[PDB]
Amino acid sequence: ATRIQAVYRDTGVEAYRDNPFIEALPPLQESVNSAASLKSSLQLTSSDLQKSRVIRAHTICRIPDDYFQPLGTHLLLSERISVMIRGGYVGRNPKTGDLQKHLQNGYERVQTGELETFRFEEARSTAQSLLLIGCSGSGKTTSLHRILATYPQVIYHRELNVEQVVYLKIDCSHNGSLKEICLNFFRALDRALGSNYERRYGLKRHGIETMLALMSQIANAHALGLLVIDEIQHLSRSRSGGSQEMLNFFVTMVNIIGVPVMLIGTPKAREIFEADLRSARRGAGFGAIFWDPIQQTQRGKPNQEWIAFTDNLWQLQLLQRKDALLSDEVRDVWYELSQGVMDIVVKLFVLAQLRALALGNERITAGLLRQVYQDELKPVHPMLEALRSGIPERIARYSDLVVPEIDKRLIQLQLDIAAIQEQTPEEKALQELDTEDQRHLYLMLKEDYDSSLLIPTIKKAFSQNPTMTRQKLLPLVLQWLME
Amino acid sequence: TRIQAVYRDTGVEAYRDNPFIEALPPLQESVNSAASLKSSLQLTSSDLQKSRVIRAHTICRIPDDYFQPLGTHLLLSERISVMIRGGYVGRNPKTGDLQKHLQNGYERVQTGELETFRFEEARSTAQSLLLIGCSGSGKTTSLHRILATYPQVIYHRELNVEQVVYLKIDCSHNGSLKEICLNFFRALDRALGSNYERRYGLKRHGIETMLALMSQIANAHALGLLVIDEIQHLSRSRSGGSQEMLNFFVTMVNIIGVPVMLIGTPKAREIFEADLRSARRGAGFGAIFWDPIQQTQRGKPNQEWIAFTDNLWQLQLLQRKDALLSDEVRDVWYELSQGVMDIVVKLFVLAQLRALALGNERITAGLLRQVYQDELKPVHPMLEALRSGIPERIARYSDLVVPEIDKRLIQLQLDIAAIQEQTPEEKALQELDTEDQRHLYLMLKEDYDSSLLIPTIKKAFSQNPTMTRQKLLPLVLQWLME
Amino acid sequence: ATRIQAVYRDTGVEAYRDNPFIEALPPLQESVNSAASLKSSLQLTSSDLQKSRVIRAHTICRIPDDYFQPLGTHLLLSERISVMIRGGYVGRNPKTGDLQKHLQNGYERVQTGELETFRFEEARSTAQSLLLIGCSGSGKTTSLHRILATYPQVIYHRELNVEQVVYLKIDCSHNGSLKEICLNFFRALDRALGSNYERRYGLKRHGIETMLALMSQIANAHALGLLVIDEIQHLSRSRSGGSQEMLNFFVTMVNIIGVPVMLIGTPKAREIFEADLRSARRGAGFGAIFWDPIQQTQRGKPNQEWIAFTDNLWQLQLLQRKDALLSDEVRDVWYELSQGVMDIVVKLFVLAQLRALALGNERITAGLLRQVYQDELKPVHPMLEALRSGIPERIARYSDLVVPEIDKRLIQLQLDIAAIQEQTPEEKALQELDTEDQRHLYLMLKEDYDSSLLIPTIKKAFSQNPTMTRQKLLPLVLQWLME
Amino acid sequence: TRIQAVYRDTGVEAYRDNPFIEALPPLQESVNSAASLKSSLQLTSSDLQKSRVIRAHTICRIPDDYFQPLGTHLLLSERISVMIRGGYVGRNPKTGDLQKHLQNGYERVQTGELETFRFEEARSTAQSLLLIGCSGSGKTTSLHRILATYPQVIYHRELNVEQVVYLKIDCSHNGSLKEICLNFFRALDRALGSNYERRYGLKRHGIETMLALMSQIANAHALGLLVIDEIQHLSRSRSGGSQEMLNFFVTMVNIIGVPVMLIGTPKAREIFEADLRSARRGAGFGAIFWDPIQQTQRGKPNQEWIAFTDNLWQLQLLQRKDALLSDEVRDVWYELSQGVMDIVVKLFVLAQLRALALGNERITAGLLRQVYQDELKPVHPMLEALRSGIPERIARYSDLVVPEIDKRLIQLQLDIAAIQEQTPEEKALQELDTEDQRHLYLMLKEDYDSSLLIPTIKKAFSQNPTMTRQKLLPLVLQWLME
Numbered sequence A, C: 001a002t003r004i005q006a007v008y009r010d011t012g013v014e015a016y017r018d019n020p021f022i023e024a025l026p027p028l029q030e031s032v033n034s035a036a037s038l039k040s041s042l043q044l045t046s047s048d049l050q051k052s053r054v055i056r057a058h059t060i061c062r063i064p065d066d067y068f069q070p071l072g073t074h075l076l077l078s079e080r081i082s083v084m085i086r087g088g089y090v091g092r093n094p095k096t097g098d099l100q101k102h103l104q105n106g107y108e109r110v111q112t113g114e115l116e117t118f119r120f121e122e123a124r125s126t127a128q129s130l131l132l133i134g135c136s137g138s139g140k141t142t143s144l145h146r147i148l149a150t151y152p153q154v155i156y157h158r159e160l161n162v163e164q165v166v167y168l169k170i171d172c173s174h175n176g177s178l179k180e181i182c183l184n185f186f187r188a189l190d191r192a193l194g195s196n197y198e199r200r201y202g203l204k205r206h207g208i209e210t211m212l213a214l215m216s217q218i219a220n221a222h223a224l225g226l227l228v229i230d231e232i233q234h235l236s237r238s239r240s241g242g243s244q245e246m247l248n249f250f251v252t253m254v255n256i257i258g259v260p261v262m263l264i265g266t267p268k269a270r271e272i273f274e275a276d277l278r279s280a281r282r283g284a285g286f287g288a289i290f291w292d293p294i295q296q297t298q299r300g301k302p303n304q305e306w307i308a309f310t311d312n313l314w315q316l317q318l319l320q321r322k323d324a325l326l327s328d329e330v331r332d333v334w335y336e337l338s339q340g341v342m343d344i345v346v347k348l349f350v351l352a353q354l355r356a357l358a359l360g361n362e363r364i365t366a367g368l369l370r371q372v373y374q375d376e377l378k379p380v381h382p383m384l385e386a387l388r389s390g391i392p393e394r395i396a397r398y399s400d401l402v403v404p405e406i407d408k409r410l411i412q413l414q415l416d417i418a419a420i421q422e423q424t425p426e427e428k429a430l431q432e433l434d435t436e437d438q439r440h441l442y443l444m445l446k447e448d449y450d451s452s453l454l455i456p457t458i459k460k461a462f463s464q465n466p467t468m469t470r471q472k473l474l475p476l477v478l479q480w481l482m483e
Numbered sequence B, D: 001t002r003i004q005a006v007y008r009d010t011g012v013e014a015y016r017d018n019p020f021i022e023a024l025p026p027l028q029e030s031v032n033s034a035a036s037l038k039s040s041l042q043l044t045s046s047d048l049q050k051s052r053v054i055r056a057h058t059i060c061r062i063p064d065d066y067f068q069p070l071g072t073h074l075l076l077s078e079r080i081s082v083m084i085r086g087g088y089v090g091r092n093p094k095t096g097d098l099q100k101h102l103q104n105g106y107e108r109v110q111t112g113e114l115e116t117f118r119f120e121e122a123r124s125t126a127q128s129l130l131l132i133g134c135s136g137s138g139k140t141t142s143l144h145r146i147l148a149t150y151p152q153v154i155y156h157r158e159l160n161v162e163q164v165v166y167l168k169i170d171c172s173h174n175g176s177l178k179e180i181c182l183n184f185f186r187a188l189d190r191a192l193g194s195n196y197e198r199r200y201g202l203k204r205h206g207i208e209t210m211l212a213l214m215s216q217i218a219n220a221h222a223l224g225l226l227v228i229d230e231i232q233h234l235s236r237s238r239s240g241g242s243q244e245m246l247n248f249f250v251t252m253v254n255i256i257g258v259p260v261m262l263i264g265t266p267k268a269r270e271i272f273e274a275d276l277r278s279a280r281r282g283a284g285f286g287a288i289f290w291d292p293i294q295q296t297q298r299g300k301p302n303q304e305w306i307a308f309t310d311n312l313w314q315l316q317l318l319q320r321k322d323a324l325l326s327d328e329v330r331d332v333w334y335e336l337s338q339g340v341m342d343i344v345v346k347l348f349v350l351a352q353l354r355a356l357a358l359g360n361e362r363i364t365a366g367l368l369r370q371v372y373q374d375e376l377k378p379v380h381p382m383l384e385a386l387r388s389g390i391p392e393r394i395a396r397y398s399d400l401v402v403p404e405i406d407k408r409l410i411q412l413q414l415d416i417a418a419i420q421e422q423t424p425e426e427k428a429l430q431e432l433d434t435e436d437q438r439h440l441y442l443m444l445k446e447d448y449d450s451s452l453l454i455p456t457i458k459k460a461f462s463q464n465p466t467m468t469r470q471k472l473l474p475l476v477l478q479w480l481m482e
């Protein structure tokens, strides 16, 4: 409930002027670069690399939750959501009379008076329902959260008495029911504002059509902008009924409420929406946007998106014996291991580096990734192979597997790794030099020259000179390597 | 669309006192009938300087909001107005009480004073029309915009009837009569608020029962016009017989009045009208035939083509655009698109999108040829047939359409957003040809800002042809210091 | 649409203290005189007598609409409806919390603390749903139409953007249906509010439950005072469905909406609700105020109501040969002629003057009333004798009977009055005499003797002194006559 | 009425950790619970001057708001509380996972370590109470207020259950079993929001099937009590005979727990208890016999009657009233009403209304005798049997009820409303008695105002009696000009 006083900006577009619902929203000019400025990545330094192994493991355990790199389609989705929100208030101007009054006074103007022609049906071209479809585990939900967290949920109005709910979310659970969607809407609406609509209308006595009609009444009462329905895949097909009647329910849901609606679903939901999507008849709506995994070869050349993302992710590792450069084959092996799917790309790193922290040397190679895939990605094999196969039915039918119990596995492996006593060559050198952490400089020195000469000579140098500047150490240690 | 009715007089003799006709918009000449359909986009001058994604979206919005009234729409508008206003004469609701007049005439004819009388006359005002034209010539967006002037639902206070002016049905994908019959109900229950589909559209009823049952609903609401489009699909299917389906379309006369308009590709005409009793009912009010625009009328350039192309060209969104359209661009446009209406605009839209993608920011004939060779693969035989000039061969290739064209428009928008990503840092960050010094430059990034450090390693290999790397690591700092 | 800004009077009763909805209503301190001020009547003078017979016919035809004399039951109905209207807003207090918050707070206080006892009885609806059963032709509809129109319909508030609809009127028609009442409520709300609720809520697709569900929402949104369903007698039982399920439907209407509701009917409709009426159960409610015709006698003496109405109605006669005093024989006869039913008593007197203006002498006789009775009370012969019988079944069977189309018959009475040739001697006397305010003396003293000498004597005096007031004229015309 | 649940500890050991008991209002001692029930009208100090109708309405409202506790109510409250909070120990929803405990007990019994173990405990029968007393003694008004403290629908959020604490069933006049069975569903889906009647109470099932479905429905929701009122209509009606009437109430053991309560008139005892297996189920938790109060207790006056009458006496609303009650009026009440509590308040209300009607404006013995002899006729045999005291004679007439009392009250209200008022100018018309007076009045209105007109008319007759109207006029006008 981020209630703010309704401050009225001025919109350059003449169509959106004078509506208390549109000008209360954030301005368009400052939000142009906000979509591309939404990137968030962990700031790492050799200080964090210096810490103990268990602290490093804890730090690298939280990679898949605080990392985000925007892609090309991530801006198209933002633009579509913005135009969907700001194109759906032209009909609900509170100060000006409703649409029917406009139609009636226009029709009396054309009869006698002076008005040559009137266009009665004004097409709702700017705003339409969207039927987001993409393979499970591609990044649909998190991108939606980070796009939609920019708009404040509640903007209270004082001159009028209306509560403006800019957006809303509905989340379906496992094997849910049709009435459970309406109950989820009621619960989320009560959560957002503080109302008690469940007490008044949440009784199971009424039918589903009553829920729909009362939902329309509530959505007309409050200024409602967007209605997002999430994870259509989880709806059970047994107790629900026919796919035809589920499609009829969704079509009726789109029309009755009167505000734009956004649906998210698996490619198996395309089977449900086969009938309504084939038809090109106007008024059906349901424009489709296809999320796809990152492709490599476009115009015969490797893509820039994958290279940039791979470098930016590879910069986020904490290993003593890593390799700075990235080989073409090293990239390729886990490319065809992962097939480009977004969710398992970070999973492969967060499993492989963690496993290498206990298997031995702290380096990444093709064999390590192959072993990790073969011994820790057991369920997701057929979908990953079918994506290479390319048969649309094979891809569609065997999707929607989510390889559960990942975080528990990460914590169990973390505690297993923490249960250890074996030494490593470099920690006794760290404790040998000092606890003052001049190992920050030692790392810049040790990679090029043998430690058996540096450690005594840097100890003598630090005895005669209490602490050399980090810039000035390398020339003088060069002098001792030159003597 | 519940528009209340207010009456206005009409000068026509036969429509003097009729509560259905007088509630419609007044009669208009050809000055405005073929001029009110015009629409165009705004494109203020301040919209040229914006992000590339917004411009791509605005370009993609073009084909839905552009309509140029040609020299043919006036005839269609006049025919539609005449057919709508000429089917209400036989269904006058406000009738002077005929009981007393009929009885008085009855006594006068029984006593011998009056030798003749007209007691009652049935309805004889059912006429149809067919409209066929080549695919992509715009037979549907030239009908929605014409019929968007008349409001659908009119409610009268004096009586208790609702006037459904027009209703549009589309044929299914496989082709049979029963889905048309049930889709009439499925398209009727949406304009009003009702539940006709579940109450009447049951499986027990046969086809003849549905046809005899449509009349009661078509008389309860004063239906004016019923347009059936995409009649193409019913040429050959599991309909039970071509002659049986033709018998259906001719026994659709028993529906009360309601003049109907049929729309189909030129493949429908020869197969579908091959008998006198059905041919005379298809062209009951003239069969309007359409054709693509011709470049040369009689050796003189047509003003229609010039005006349409110039008005389309004045709707361009590029940073580097030439204001005037050179003759070669128009000539190449007509050579590629070949005249059909739908391919004239698709070439322009795709050319603009691919010019945005390539970064040329200019439209040229070579780019149009490239797009026509690239994306319009399935339609080529139809264009070559129109180039040939053989009427039968053109009739054979007359139902070719681009598949998943809306899908391709999205895939061209995705590439736009990727290339726009460009930041000031990688004027020095994005070059890997400097050296492999980036192995150690990672620590050098935090040491100082690379005001000259990136040029320092850049000047390192320029100054030094070859040197051992292990000596370069401190000597780069020597170059950094000096 | 009397959108007056709410002026908040103060009422000394503790229950109505500081309620924004209640205070906007008119005050009740001298409403007894206001309730007794409903009386309305035409103004008639002696001038209208000398007009032509068509003008008198129009004047007589104007009497039924603009005559109203309050009786005993009107005061009781006014006070009861005032109690129902004003007691209906103690629950929906806008400034403080609603009912559910009060019950929850009471439960939380009785749980622990020292609030020993809390009563959960709450309000049954908010006032009893009165059922005003009475015989047709008694005058219910006009009584409500006048005593319910002294309250402004809409009180448009200022700080709260809500409309305080104070009363409403549903009305069924011949051969109605169960869903027709639900549709008509929505349709009639538009005329009171000016909106288009029928477009969004009046779809025929909705079931009977959804109509009531939406009615609950809209009745809670707009502060509603009353809901007067009228003419249940017109409904047909078999067309709607099960007759015994109508009582279930009406109980569901009373329970869900929550605002006070008052039905109207005839003893034919009583058998629908008789199951709840016989039981003294609290919660069934449906208290009945029985409407009965005027009784002639009280304690072995004529009832004062009958004579009080009779004299007042008898003062409106403008007969030319009329005597000042009403004779006792006709007083005895028309009660048994009409059984005291309120509607037809006035109708007999209306038709008597029209019949006497054409049949001959201008007076009132028992035979004239008998002749009118056989003329224009043919459809109501069975019900009148059923009332005479006194058996409840005979009265119940013959209820709902009304005379059709009396107004059209009045027009043909007037047309027949228009076409006549011969004239009365008094018509000759008024025509030949200069009847410009000189007529009054002649009329007031015409019946003393023959007017043959009177016609020139008044002229002699008037020409003797043209300038006189009638006040001084009367002694002189009286003095010259006796000579 | 969906009150959310907040728990509280209970001192009783057996009600340890069971939400159903602990979600209810806490225990109170009898005197407090039997003293918190009293209520009375406001009786504002200065509301003794008003219109007659408003005061008449206030007096008519008296019977619905006057309640006064007595001795038996505390015992009734204790029994009701014990029944409601003693039938919930068998059903404790909060149970730990009993699979492991039961299987471990089975293992230790099987291996020979243990010797005995109680696996599953099943409930047996149910408690029941019957409350019988002569009609009009307050067996329903004293039950709609004792049960008012307990909330009806408690909602558990941690679980998903609704606790329907109490439910009131009333048999109809027919007395058939299926009416009771369907009325249970009516009351239950009136308490909650549901449609149980259509889902279960169809015509298809027989009596045994609904009787068995009541158990499932009363275990799905946690019932606490079930009171059946007016059982006297099941004595000898068309319910299949007294044998099946006994068998149905005996077979009502199969309903799970839910201690039932039976209320009836003293005649129902003989019909309802004639077999040993049914009487011990009727009086399973006592058998309290109500009886009207008496003036004396043991050679001395009873204080409860004194308190009841004295407290009732102040509540009257009259212009001039004797606040200090005279003992003669109390003796008159005990002579007429004889003790039954229904008649005591009705006599007072009717006497007050008739006192306002007559204008005597005082409550005295004569008015009480007149109203008792006029109105309360049918109740006479019961009172005359009460005077004698013979058990068979009093048992013969313990079912009589006065009808049409509400209609009589409404007609009395109309009578006192129709008093109206007489202005002095209007009264002047009534002053004129001879018909000639009124005739001369009617002729002589227009010229003269009535105030001066009536006196000179009256002296005209007081001076000269036998002299005619036309001869009267000159002398009247002679008086008038002067």
Ligand SMILES: Nc1ncnc2c1ncn2[C@@H]1O[C@H](COP(=O)(O)OP(=O)(O)O)[C@@H](O)[C@H]1O
Binding pocket: A063, A064, A065, A066, A067, A068, A069, A070, A071, A135, A136, A137, A138, A139, A140, A141, A142, A143, A342, A343, A346
């Ligand atoms: N563009 C992205 N950049 C970085 N991480 C991403 C991106 N998209 C998805 N992820 C990662 O994928 C993980 C799971 O994605 P999720 O939203 O669950 O997809 P889905 O809902 O389809 O399973 C997230 O923890 C997130 O870190």
Ligand SMILES: Nc1ncnc2c1ncn2[C@@H]1O[C@H](COP(=O)(O)OP(=O)(O)O)[C@@H](O)[C@H]1O
Binding pocket: B063, B064, B066, B067, B068, B069, B070, B134, B135, B136, B137, B138, B139, B140, B141, B142, B341, B342, B345
């Ligand atoms: N006069 C016109 N100007 C510009 N575009 C037009 C015109 N007429 C039709 N179109 C284009 O044609 C398309 C519609 O073609 P349509 O009528 O569906 O073909 P078909 O009748 O073969 O189905 C629209 O997208 C519209 O852009």
Ligand SMILES: Nc1ncnc2c1ncn2[C@@H]1O[C@H](COP(=O)(O)OP(=O)(O)O)[C@@H](O)[C@H]1O
Binding pocket: C064, C067, C068, C069, C070, C136, C137, C138, C139, C140, C141, C142, C342, C343, C346
């Ligand atoms: N005080 C009165 N004076 C004259 N007419 C009355 C009076 N009260 C009622 N009426 C008559 O009652 C009639 C309307 O009541 P009625 O038709 O019985 O109601 P409903 O239509 O509900 O049966 C009117 O025609 C009116 O003449």
Ligand SMILES: Nc1ncnc2c1ncn2[C@@H]1O[C@H](COP(=O)(O)OP(=O)(O)O)[C@@H](O)[C@H]1O
Binding pocket: D063, D064, D066, D067, D068, D069, D134, D135, D136, D137, D138, D139, D140, D141, D142, D341, D342, D345
């Ligand atoms: N404690 C009481 N004090 C005063 N009046 C009472 C009391 N109990 C009952 N009454 C009166 O009894 C009437 C209801 O009687 P009821 O209980 O229905 O009789 P029964 O139990 O025979 O059906 C009420 O009008 C009420 O005034």
Ligand SMILES: [Mg+2]
Binding pocket: A140, A141, A231
């Ligand atoms: Mg998801």
Ligand SMILES: [Mg+2]
Binding pocket: B139, B140, B229, B230
């Ligand atoms: Mg088409």
Ligand SMILES: [Mg+2]
Binding pocket: C141, C231
């Ligand atoms: Mg009526």
Ligand SMILES: [Mg+2]
Binding pocket: D139, D140, D229, D230
């Ligand atoms: Mg009782």
